[PDB]
Each structure stands twice: as structure tokens, then as C-alpha cells.
Design a binder for this molecule. Structure first.
Ligand code: HEM
Ligand code: HEM
Lengths: 362, 362
């Protein structure tokens, strides 16, 4: 029904993957540090309400008739829907509020990668909120009301809706398929693997940035798929691109989805072979991305793909090496990265008196 | 999870309980060969029988010749039917092709220009439409993607619209959903159990003058942008006055319960419910079946948000047109703008396994 908001870590990273996403990047419009801290406190208070299925402020109705309602009301009657709200800080935030010397070294700017076609309007951002829930209306309501609360101090830079599985009709254990029709998520870090999360996902105090202890680093990539091109490829071409078969999702030469891959049986430029930790010095990611389908473009093509989200302990040792290794990926024929942003995701809100960003702002 | 039967006197997806998700596509026809188009309709019908039963199209998604593209794109494998319905419609522009000019129904009226219209021509009209509704977005996208693929060379997608959540009801026994203005939308509609009301107001009858359309309906699609910044600063009282119902319960002004009958004289004269109500429009009644959308940001720091309004009716001239004309003075107009428009003739149902979409026309 709901996911606890408080903890050492923000929810929405290691907690169970919800059916739907609304991710928003915001830009900050105030120069006043005190004004921004006040916002973070008001947002935290709102998030406590939202994640428990309650309206923000004094509610969506029943207040003074002459006042705008505190909550815009489109989630009334809905359940918490396992809503999580996860905040992150972009590199550009640290050019404000005297913060330049507190930017973590682990929050690295991404290099340009071969084939990148990044839309500057759908890239970057001073901060992000990742809203995940089983009901898309719950997620949208959250973003819409945070944006409203922050009006005058932040604006929405870009926004992405996504979807994974529908849990009401799909067993939890079953691996979702992406829009290329392949199972996606088989070899990932699971929220159950506490030690692997410590190794690969959570920032530690000895990593160099104390305020980030218990936080993580997020890379977002909006990756368009060339659907109509992919759909004309033979079955064998598609399986060769990945190194797993399409039906069962087993590694080539193996029988079952979760059989461990034998990388040498895969083509040298197969996606799994290039992405696997063993090909990348042990680098391992927590993927937590969502499919998207936004409509059709001016050529009549489906505007669809993967909104890739990766969490890691250090961008320089997680996404960067793995993505660099995909330079010759067979998948590259069929995809294009068109949006990108990175964020530092702070530690959790410890209790009722804490607030988002408290370890940074002090 | 369950399947909705595909065959019947009427197409499913109209009187059917409203599903959670929409993917609507308008297509233009690129072939002038009547026989080629008829063969497409038949192949599409076959596919639809598979898809609505939760089966892959053609020979499947895998297990065929390795050197061939799979017949089904694969991304719905392991999913339930998820109440998928597929509803086809023919736009006025289709009747300029294939010797069909004299068979265009009079009830398929072109809309007049309405005050405030700002229609994008690229996201209006269409030779034909397919409305895919399902509780799982992935299942809806899969259906449209596979129909489009099958249609390659004979049809192109002109425009499409995804709806992330419903803002309509054909099931008064269940909770009425809310639109993004925070109001319940669908209280006084037509229920799928109200056979006499459907016969009166929704299905075309032989005597209406177009035999091939008997058992079909007419569809009006309107893409409506919502000025949420404007709306969100309005007082509670102003918002309730706009509609004539209270926000929390959705009762008519003065009354206690959502489903209490409106007393129209207690509403403001420009209240939406007052203007839209059948009693204000010579008895004209519609089956409303629309969905909410958000398509990112507007470029000005705000979330985009809208309603994709769908209405079914026995005759466009006696349904949508009179009602929309009466909304010329609607208080709601301050907060919305119609930016896309299309009309379609929705043919009768596919009677059995030997029948096909459009068979009464062709
Ligand atoms: C649209 C883009 C992409 C698609 C469709 C895609 C698809 C897949 C699929 C089908 C698998 C195999 C099943 C699984 O273990 O999840 C896989 C594995 C993986 N992908 Fe991708 N991927 C995409 C982009 C990326 C990107 C950008 C990265 C990282 C930079 C990435 C990293 C990985 C990793 C680390 C694995 C697991 C390899 C292993 O340990 O076996 N993928 N991906
Ligand atoms: C963004 C646009 C719109 C919004 C937010 C909206 C909202 C509402 C709401 C809150 C109600 C009251 C609950 C109900 O009975 O469903 C309602 C009723 C209704 N609306 Fe709208 N509506 C919009 C557009 C339209 C349009 C374009 C039409 C027709 C051309 C329409 C026709 C109706 C009708 C017929 C009723 C039922 C009136 C009655 O019989 O009580 N609406 N709408």
C-alpha cells in the first residue's frame, strides 16, 4: 500500500519498483539561500503527506472559499499507491548559494559519447524529483503540487512520464520487457542485496563528501528507440544484438533466463557482453529505468524508448565506464541518446523534524 | 486482467467499462487500391482478434525462421489481455477514396469553428482511427504498434495521443475518476447497462438514413489544453462556481451527494454543468469517454496538461455540436483551449469470426 518516507536512505532507489514514473527536472530561479531552504522544508512536509496518501497543506477542499485550495485535488479518492519521492541536486545547483566547494567529486560531468544527440531542453537541471507510484495520477499529482508550491522559486525544466509493469495483472517476480520485446532487468542489483548496495550504490563517508553519506548518484538518459527499424530486423539479428534469446531471455547457449551468461558465446559487440561487469573491471549499476511512449513524431514514427535511470556510488566508476564500453554496441544502430542529466541524491529524511537537503544546507 | 469480447453487434470500447489507459492513433491512407485496403482491414481484424485475447499476432513473437522479422514485436508477451479494446473509425476524408463518396453518412458532419478554437492541423483529422484502451499501457502501445506495422505501405500514422488516466465513466457503481482540475468527471454519463439510453443516444439505427452504419456510432475527439497555472490560483469558490458542483464530493451545488440530481437554477448561468446538461440542450446527451494527458513541459517552466475529450453519439449534429455551441459562454472557457479536433464514423461490430472491420461499408 505505502512505502515509508523516512529512513537512512531516500526511498525510491532500493525499495520495490513501482509501476509508473513521473520524473521532473527543475531549475532554481532564486538567488536567496534562505528562500531555497524554506522551500526544501515545505517540500519535505508536502512529501510526507503525499507519500501517505494525504493532501498537501490544509487539503483539497473545505478551507476558506475565497482561497485557492492547498492541494489541487486530482488524487482525492486514490490510494498511496506505493508513492516514493526522491530528490536530487544537479551540478548547476552548486554554482548558487555559495555551494561550489561542496559539489561532490563523484558528481562528475558526463563526457560526450559517440552518437549522442542530446536535446539541451531535455537535459540538465538544477534539481530533480523522481516520483514513482503504481498509479500515474498519484505520481503526476505529486509533481504538479510540488511545482505549484515552489512557483516563484523553481520552474519545471523538463518532465518525463514512464511505465514498467502493471502489477495488478503481472506477477511481481516476472521480469518486465522493454519496448524492443526483450526482458530487461534480469542481471541487476536488487533491493534485497544489502551488501551489493553498500558496495555499488550508496555513498560512504570515506568517499570524500560527508554530506552525501547514505545518498547516491543518479544518471538519467532519455534513449529513443528506432522502433520501425528494429521491427524490420530478423529474429536472429535482434537476439545477436543482445546475446540473449527473445522468448525466454536466456544467454546464448543456456536454457533459462537466470542462467549465468557465458560471454564468449556472444558476439563481441553484443550489448550484454559489453555491459557485463566482467567486461568493465567489475563496474556494476542499479538500473531503475522505465519505458516511455510519448506519441508519434512528424515523420509518423513512434516516439518511444527507455528512460534509463542508474544509481551508483560514483558516476566515474559506474555509468561512465560501462557507457564508454558501449561505443561499439550492436544496439547503437537502433537507439539514440537524446537527453541526459546527472544528480546527487542526498541521504534520507531521518525523522519528522528532518528535511530534504539538511546535510548540505546545514 | 480479463478479456473483453471482441465480437458483437457493436464494437467494444464504447459502452464497455472505461479502462485505465488510452492510446489513440489517427492514420492516413496512402494506397488508392480498394482491394489492398480491404485486404488490410481483414488482416487488421485478424490481428485484433489475437490482440484482444492476449495472443501474439500472426505466427508469434518468436520460434519462427531465424532470418525473418517476427510477426509480433514481442513486448506484450506474458501479459494478460488487460481489458484491451480496439475500436476503429473512419474519418470524412476516407470517403474521397475508393469510390466511397456517396456512402459518407450525413451524421458524419464536419464541425463548425467554435469561439476560442486554436486547432493544430497536424494533430487534427485523419482518414481513420484506432482507439486502443486497456488497463496496461504496454498492451495498448503493442496493439497500435503492431497494427501500424501490418499497415506499412498502405497507412501512415498521422497523429497519436496517449492518455495516462481516464476522466470518464460508463459504470456508475464504481468511483468516478477525477480530471487534472481536481473534479470528478463522468457522474452523469450513459452507463453501459442503460440499453435504452444507448439505443436512443449512441448507436446509429437503420432509419437514420445510412444502412451500413446501423449499430455503429459517431466519434468526436477534441484535444483540450488546460491552463493549470490560471486554474491553480483560482479560489475554491471560483472553481466550484465554474462547474456547479462542489469539489470534494462532486455534489450539485446545495446538495449532499455526488449522484443527487442537479438543480440547475441554483448554479451560475455560465456554469459548465448547467450549460452542458441535456435539459439545457433540447435533450441532447453524449457518451463521454475521454482521458487525461500530459506531454512534458510547455517550454515556459510549467507542466503541460490536458484532457483528450472523446464523445460518442448517434449523430454528431444532435450530440456534440449543440452541446459545444451552448458552451460558448461557459465559465470553464477561461481555463481551457481546444487545440486538436477530429470526427469519425465508428462502424458496427464484427459479428463473428468470418466478419471484418468495415465489411458493411465495403
Ligand atoms: C534503450 C537502451 C537499452 C536497452 C533496450 C537495454 C537492454 C538491455 C537488456 C535486454 C539487457 C539484458 C537483460 C538484463 O540483464 O537486464 C540489458 C542488460 C544490461 N544493460 Fe542494457 N539496455 C539499454 C541501455 C543500457 C545502457 C545505457 C546501459 C549502461 C550504460 C545499460 C547497461 C546494462 C547492464 C549493466 C546490463 C546487465 C549486464 C549483465 O550484467 O549481464 N544498458 N540491457
Ligand atoms: C477540459 C474540459 C472539460 C472538463 C474539465 C470538464 C469537466 C466536467 C465536470 C467536472 C463535469 C461534472 C461531472 C459530470 O457529470 O461528468 C462535467 C460534466 C459534463 N460535461 Fe464536461 N468537461 C470538459 C469538457 C467538456 C466538453 C468539451 C463537453 C461537450 C462538448 C462536455 C460535456 C459535459 C456534459 C454533457 C456533462 C454532463 C452534464 C449533466 O448532464 O449533468 N464537457 N464536465
Amino acid at each position: 500500500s505505502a512505502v515509508p518516507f523516512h529512513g537512512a536512505h531516500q526511498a525510491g532507489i532500493a525499495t520495490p519498483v513501482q509501476d509508473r514514473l513521473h520524473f521532473a527536472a527543475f531549475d532554481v530561479t532564486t538567488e536567496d539561500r534562505a528562500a531555497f531552504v524554506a522551500l526544501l522544508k515545505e517540500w519535505t512536509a508536502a512529501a510526507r503527506r503525499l507519500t501517505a496518501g494525504h493532501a498537501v497543506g490544509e487539503g483539497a477542499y473545505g478551507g476558506l472559499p475565497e482561497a485557492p485550495p492547498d492541494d489541487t485535488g486530482e488524487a482525492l479518492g486514490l490510494k498511496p499507491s506505493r508513492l516514493t519521492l526522491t530528490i536530487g541536486f544537479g551540478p548547476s545547483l552548486f554554482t548558487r548559494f555559495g555551494l561550489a566547494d561542496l559539489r561532490p567529486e563523484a558528481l562528475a560531468d558526463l563526457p560526450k559519447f559517440p552518437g549522442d544527440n542530446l536535446d539541451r531542453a531535455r537535459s540538465g537541471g538544477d534539481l530533480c524529483v523522481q516520483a514513482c507510484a503504481d498509479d500515474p495520477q498519484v505520481a503526476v499529482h505529486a509533481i504538479r503540487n510540488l511545482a505549484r508550491i515552489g512557483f516563484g522559486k523553481v520552474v519545471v525544466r523538463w518532465s518525463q512520464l514512464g511505465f514498467g509493469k502493471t502489477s495488478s495483472t503481472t506477477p511481481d517476480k516476472q521480469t518486465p520487457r522493454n519496448l524492443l520485446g526483450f526482458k530487461d532487468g534480469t542481471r541487476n542489483i536488487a533491493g534485497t542485496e544489502k551488501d551489493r548496495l553498500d558496495r555499488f550504490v550508496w555513498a560512504a563517508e570515506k568517499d570524500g563528501t560527508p554530506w552525501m553519506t547514505g545518498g547516491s548518484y543518479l544518471v538519467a538518459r532519455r534513449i529513443r528507440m528506432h522502433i520501425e527499424t528494429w521491427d524490420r530486423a530478423s529474429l536472429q539479428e535482434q537476439e545477436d544484438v543482445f546475446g540473449r534469446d527473445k522468448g525466454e531471455g536466456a544467454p546464448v547457449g543456456k536454457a533459462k533466463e537466470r542462467d549465468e551468461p557465458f560471454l564468449k558465446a556472444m558476439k563481441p559487440d553484443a550489448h550484454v557482453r559489453l555491459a557485463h561487469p566482467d567486461s568493465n573491471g567489475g563496474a556494476t549499476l542499479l538500473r531503475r529505468g522505465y519505458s516511455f511512449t510519448d506519441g508519434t513524431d512528424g515523420l509518423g514514427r513512434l516516439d518511444a524508448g527507455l528512460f534509463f535511470l542508474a544509481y551508483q556510488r560514483d558516476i566515474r566508476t559506474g555509468f561512465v565506464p560501462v557507457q564508454r564500453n558501449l561505443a561499439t554496441d550492436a544496439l547503437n544502430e537502433f537507439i539514440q541518446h537524446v537527453g541526459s542529466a546527472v544528480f546527487a541524491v542526498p541521504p534520507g529524511v531521518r525523522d519528522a523534524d528532518d528535511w530534504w537537503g539538511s546535510t548540505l544546507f546545514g
